[model samples]
Each structure stands twice: as structure tokens, then as C-alpha cells.
Target chain A: RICFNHQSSQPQTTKTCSPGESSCYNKQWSDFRGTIIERGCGCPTVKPGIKLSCCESEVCNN
Target chain B: RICFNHQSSQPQTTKTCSPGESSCYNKQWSDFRGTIIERGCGCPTVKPGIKLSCCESEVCNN
Candidate 1:
């Protein structure tokens, strides 16, 4: 399961993608408010530093 | 002003990053509910296709 933890003041939101699905997803977090967290299917994920979209493309869809 | 118009079911929420800021921002729109649209400083943007993170990132922090 593609899971992630959203760092937030209002209790970090943890979410998981679809089970038994090999589809990729995009997870994000910010130092701003609680509105800076999101997880969607499509965008692949890496480790360590967070990946930044230097440009626009087809984001998490499924 | 880095402004974006959100495509939503109800009234869309359009938000601007900031003025006179050179930091790039991530703009996204989804077929889900209204939690899709967002524009923040960091992550550059392209056109036509929405940018997907394909991974985690320290997105829009300006």
C-alpha cells in the first residue's frame, strides 16, 4: 500500500493509496499551513529530500 | 501574482502565491472533490497537463 504521513498541526493526516494496486502516487508536505499536504495516484515517490516539480505535468490521477 | 483558477464542481477556489516572487509554484486540478486546486511558491508549472509530483517534495513554501 502506498502510504504517507502528512505533517500537520491539526494531527498529521496519514493516507494510503489503493491496496493491491501497483499504480504510483505523489505525496507532498509543506511548512506552511495544514493545506500543504496531499497524496494522489500517478506521481512516483523517492526518498530523503522531497521531489519538486520544476514544471507542470500530468499529476496524480488514479 | 502567481494565480490559478481551480476547476471544481461548486465555486472554484482560485489562489495566488505571491507578488514579486521568483519562486516557482505547483498548480494542480483533480476530478475528485474540491481538494485539488492549489498554488504555492516552489515547483514550476507547465501547461495543458497538470504537474504530478511522482514522489514526495517540499512543495510551495513561499
Candidate 2:
């Protein structure tokens, strides 16, 4: 699967996942700079108060 | 803004929105075929029990 890959303040791009990975993830959190969004392949290890959404489709984290 | 435009059983595609449309929406529901996802530009006019998520960034409904 392919996913949107990016961190806060960066340009968004796509990444092709490695074998056995079937999901893409979008994670959101708040910091001093307000809301920040991060996306990548697979589910992220999130901390408390982080909002994460995972979907099983190409570019689903966009 | 651009949004992923698709209905159940169709290939997903992108659509450029008309002027002043600043959000993208993803709506999901269930039927006999299981879960169905629909995406498009702008916040959708949804009924009860429809799972709707809207975001202001491009293609965020993907």
C-alpha cells in the first residue's frame, strides 16, 4: 500500500509500504504551534491525547 | 481544494472543488455488503448514523 508521508511544516509526499504492511495512518496532536498532523505507512505508536486514524487503501492517509 | 471523490465499488479519483469550498468529507455507513465509504468536496448533508468527518486541507478525506 501507499501512504501520505509527512511531518508538520513539511511538504507532503507518498511512500510505498514494505511487504506485509496493509494500512496507512494519519496522526494528529497539539503542541505549542497548534495542531500538527503526521502521516505514514502502518499504525503509529501513539501517546496519550494523540488522534490516529488508519485506513486500508492506497493514499488513504492524505 | 481537492478531494477524493468516490462511492462504494468504484475506483477512487480526485476532484477539484469549486470556489469557496474549503473542506473535504468522508462519509461511511453499513449495508448488506458491509461498510461503504463515500468521499467528496465539502461537508456532506448527512443523516443520522452516518459517520462523517470533514477536514479543511486538501484530500484529507482520503
Candidate 3:
């Protein structure tokens, strides 16, 4: 599957998932720079003060 | 401003945010039935294990 790969300091882009990785995730949190968003493949473990959303379709994290 | 209002068991729709309420939020979490998603206007306090994303634009939570 494909997912949107993004970082706070970089332009957004798409990425092909690795074998056996089926989910796309969008994670958000706040810092000194306000809210930050990141997207990638796989449902990662949640961290304190972070928000994570995971889905099972192409570019679902968008 | 307007925001998407949704519940896990209901159809997705829109809502006019109250005056001074300029943010829309999408929250997701897992339960016995799988992931549950909720959307509405305004930022809310985060709960344990809940993923919440809030944005300051129209229908941004989608």
C-alpha cells in the first residue's frame, strides 16, 4: 500500500509501504511551533500528548 | 467556520462552529469493535489512549 510520508520541516510526499505493512498513519502533536503533523506507514505506539490515526487503504492517512 | 461532525455510529455531516470556536477536531481510538472516530468543533482535552487531531480550517479533520 501507499501512504503519505510527511515531516514538519519537509514537503509532503507519498511512500510505498514495505512488505506486510498495510496501514497508513497520521500523527499530530503540539510544540513550541504549534501543531506538528507526520504521516507514514504502520500503526506506531502512541506517545504521551500525541495523536495517532491509522487506516488500511491507499493514502488513507491524508 | 464550519466543521465536520461525525460519530462512529452515525453518518458524517457538518456543523457551524460557535463564535470564537475556530478549530475542528478528529479523534480516534480502538475498542472492541475496532477503531472509533469522532469529529466536531473546538479542541478538547485529550484522554488516555485517545488520538486527537485539531485543525484551524474548514473540514480539516477529514
By lDDT, rank the candidates, best first.
2, 3, 1
Cα lDDT, model 1, residue A22: 34
Residues A21-42 of candidate 2: C-alpha lDDT, one tens digit per residue: 9768788888998999899898
Chain A accuracy of model 2 expressed as TM-score:
0.88
lDDT tens per residue, model 2, B2-61: 888988668878999999997677888899998899998887667866666556666767
Over all chains combined, what TM-score does candidate 2 have? 0.51
Alpha-carbon deviation at B4 in model 1, angstroms: 2.5
Q: Model 3, range A1-62, lDDT digits (tens) per residue? A: 89899876567799999999976877888889987889999878666556665666677676
Best by DockQ: 1
TM-score of chain B of each: 0.28, 0.87, 0.89
Candidate 1 segments exceeding 4 Å error: A1-62, B5-16, B23-35, B44-50, B53-62
**Chain A TM-score of prediction number 3:** 0.86
What does DockQ come to for candidate 3?
0.06
**Winner on DockQ (1 vs 3):** 1
Report the C-alpha lDDT of model 1 over B2-62, residue by residue, as the tens digit: 4333433335344554555434444556664644645544444445555433222322322
